[PDB]
Amino acid sequence: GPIITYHSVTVPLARCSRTFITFSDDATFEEWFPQGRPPKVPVREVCPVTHRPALYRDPVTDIPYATARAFKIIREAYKKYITAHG
Amino acid sequence: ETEIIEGEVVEIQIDRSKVGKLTLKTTEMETIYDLGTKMIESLTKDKVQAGDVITIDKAT
């Protein structure tokens, strides 16, 4: 069956101990070692209204903001967009 | 002196419980937060649902 073999040997350098791990199938090897690439640094979003670093994210418009006035302006713009496009 | 998040819970969505989103609002603000494993566990333990007014300590 699909097994993981743990092996410890005595081998000459007058002798030294070495350990090996053997995976029967490549699926187990991929599962234990996905070789994931390094993650990406997220873009530090900025509020379109006040240009300050973003701290919040309005769920309806998905527009980041950092001030209550910015939120009010964003919601007013969204209301105007709804009125225009309909 | 401690930083806290304070708002009314609007929606709690948990996908399957590894990841989820929490929406909090004030009378002048509304935002959505991405939750982790421990935050989801803490929210489920306290049985937080919509309409609940809660505070969350940022540090702990």
């Binding site: 309806v60 998905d62 969204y78 967009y81 | 609007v10």
Partner: peptide, 27 residues
């Protein structure tokens, strides 16, 4: 600061149901 009052409670109870929350839009 955020204790309810009888006036606010009565206003919320008598007022109609709030409009449905708009669906999220990627904007």
């Amino acid at each position: 600061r955020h204790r309810l009052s009888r006036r606010v409670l009565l206003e919320v109870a008598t007022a109609p149901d709030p409009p449905p929350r708009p669906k999220p839009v990627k904007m």
